[PDB]
Amino acid sequence: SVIKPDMKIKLRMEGAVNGHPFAIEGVGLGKPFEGKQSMDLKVKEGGPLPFAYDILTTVFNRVFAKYPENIVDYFKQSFPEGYSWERSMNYEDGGICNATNDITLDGDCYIYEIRFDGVNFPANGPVMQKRTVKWEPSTEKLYVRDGVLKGDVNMALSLEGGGHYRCDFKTTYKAKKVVQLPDYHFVDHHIEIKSHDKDYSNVNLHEHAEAHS
Amino acid sequence: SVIKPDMKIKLRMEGAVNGHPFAIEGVGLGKPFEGKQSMDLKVKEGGPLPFAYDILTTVFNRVFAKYPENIVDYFKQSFPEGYSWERSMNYEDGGICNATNDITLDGDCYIYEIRFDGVNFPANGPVMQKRTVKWEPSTEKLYVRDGVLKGDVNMALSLEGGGHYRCDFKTTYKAKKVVQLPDYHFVDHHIEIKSHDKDYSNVNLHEHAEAHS
Amino acid sequence: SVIKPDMKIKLRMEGAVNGHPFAIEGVGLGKPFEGKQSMDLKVKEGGPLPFAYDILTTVFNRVFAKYPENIVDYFKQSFPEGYSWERSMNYEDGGICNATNDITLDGDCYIYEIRFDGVNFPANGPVMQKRTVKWEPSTEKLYVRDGVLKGDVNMALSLEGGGHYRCDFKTTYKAKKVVQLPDYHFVDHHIEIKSHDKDYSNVNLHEHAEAHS
Amino acid sequence: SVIKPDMKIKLRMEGAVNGHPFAIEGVGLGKPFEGKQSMDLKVKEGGPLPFAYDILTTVFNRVFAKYPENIVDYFKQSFPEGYSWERSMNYEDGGICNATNDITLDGDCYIYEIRFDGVNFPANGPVMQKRTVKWEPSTEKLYVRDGVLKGDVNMALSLEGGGHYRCDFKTTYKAKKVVQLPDYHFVDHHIEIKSHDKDYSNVNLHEHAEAHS
């Protein structure tokens, strides 16, 4: 009833990388039951971004994940009230990004309030030199911890001219009401930038996700 | 030719946890092309083990993983010469286990020389209090780094009376000859202790693994 | 010439902890050559703060450090233009705080623009439980990398009722102009909340710092 | 009574780095009350060592630390029975070394049983490249947890041609009998290889340590 087959997305991200502020706004559409979403993002402050756009994309909602009937869906349960999440993104060269998303619902439209803060990316690293190609597909591991839901994922950015650049995601998901806590399960992800302009001031972003156990 | 549908396993692990030495020997059988193996393990030194047996089980060979024709198989390529691996296992409460395996082939039998060293497990933690139930199934992420193969996995031990206890695996695999390096891929794992005696001096251990991309 | 024996401080911090937004303003005075400073801090938004105030205090300027003749002073060199820093603060229970400070100089007064973002603090951890007493005195180790100055410190919070809580600091300092780079050295720190009200709405904060080789 | 102004040291280390096995023996002498020691170390197996010798030196006894009257001496208290320690050494490029030392006393001579295991050192990192010069002087922070003594230290290796390489030490000290526990304190360390041959087959190693509050 609350979750519709076709829903809208509106977001604003405010943040900084290595002390340099930026802001991005986005509008999109998603199919919660099919685990598919797409959005168009516009850099409003800090452009052209002096860092790899890819570090931001997984911050731009696990309601857009196909959950089978036999797995408890923490996220679709949380609405209309919604949920928030916190995440640390620990890169292998010491770059660390912290992010949050507060997700509310206005009719058939999700509203995101996002904060993003990254520090200690080396000037000669693949992030500050914009040498990333894409995130590889992933499998997130989800488990309950002290009444809330945790999700951890080993992530990897493919690099221009070969190799990978690793990042460890640790997410905590917090429902704004009492919902059923799921057993240990997995979510397969695949995030892709389908189109962008020269300096990534405009980006079309897609994600597909499916839960399994 | 070198890899047979039915192969044998013989291993010896020497190690220590929190400064207390132990040794385990095992014999087993595996189906390399089906990604299935099973073994019987006997504690030879340090028994009865004062720590959770589960911390050891993933140390007791990625040749026992079903690789599809479209994914380069680093491990089956490495034989008859074989390969070695190194691993750090970083637990959330500061317990750290380092492990190595040197894998050789004698006819149709793999021979493992294993070293295992764990430190800083709290006395009141789930490892030293033997409060673990099993490892959850997992998805390992494999990627090439500087001419060798890396494999990282987010692991979780289910606990007696609820909850999970997290560990981060970082493995480096090193072929003893020049082999083809694979593209980014995944291996699904499920390791299970099928039977054991009261103090885990005798353990029957099973693993199923399948690669995908 | 621009560095005076007696100088003023004005600051604003905007931040969030576990997605809870807050803002703090500060006014103070410091003696750059004696490595002593003090300030009055006022919570302006997000009060009363639902976390241990001590996580913020080391974010509220290494210009206030007594540097001997034999060590190059990276920070006093940087003015009037000034410098900025970025820091990751990695707590032993997985809580991570990222912070930045952009420091400018207007007359005899330093102006700070501060951002603070902490995520994944466990509900039952000493930060969210407000169970910290003080930071123990510390020794920061400073070393050059990639033409900028790094500062790392092993930090510990004393806990109410006994025990300690560990945090590892990794700071990158960045002068806004080309300055002479120092060799490996140490800075001894002692930070103390001298007075506060019940909810820490008002805090008097003191720091003493001295460099040595 | 059992602690004399002049005491002897005999040790054996068995270990591996990146799966390469080695063994080292040592004989030395130390002055427990002055916090000074020196020893001659001889590679017995696995020579010539294919890694930076400096990773081993802090593993080759806090009984050799000058303790003032106002601080409880955990280590001198523990004898004649003695104590053991465990340590994780986490390097910034992902190399991790675990080590243990079991220290006993026979007459005026300390006997060490040492285990050392390092994994995941990158082929192009300063350890496998043998590009380290020395450990910088350090300050260890010691604090009680769970009835045992913890010691943590932010460590840095000076690199040949310039720059530094960071490692975080986490040590747990365990007395074999019930002893008085100290409050939070510091131990200043200075470790130096005074002489060695080309392949480090023979090494003369010195350490000076002093506690302070």
From TrEMBL, chains A, B, C, D:
Gene3D superfamilies in alphabetical order: 3.30.1300.40, Green fluorescent protein
SUPFAM superfamilies: GFP-like (SSF54511)
Keyword Amino-acid biosynthesis (UniProt): no
Residue positions binding Cu(2+) 2: H206, H208
PTM-bearing positions, type Phenylalanine amide: F60
GO MF annotation terms: identical protein binding; metal ion binding
Keyword Acetylation: no
Alphabetical keyword list: Chromophore, Luminescence, Metal-binding, Photoprotein
Binding-site residues, Cu(2+) 1: H196
UniProt superkingdom: Eukaryota
One GO-annotated biological process of the protein: generation of precursor metabolites and energy
InterPro entries (alphabetical): GFP (IPR009017), GFP-related (IPR011584), Green_fluorescent_prot (IPR000786)
Annotated family: Belongs to the GFP family.
Name of the protein described by the UniProt record: Fluorescent protein Dronpa
Species per Swiss-Prot/TrEMBL record: Echinophyllia sp. SC22
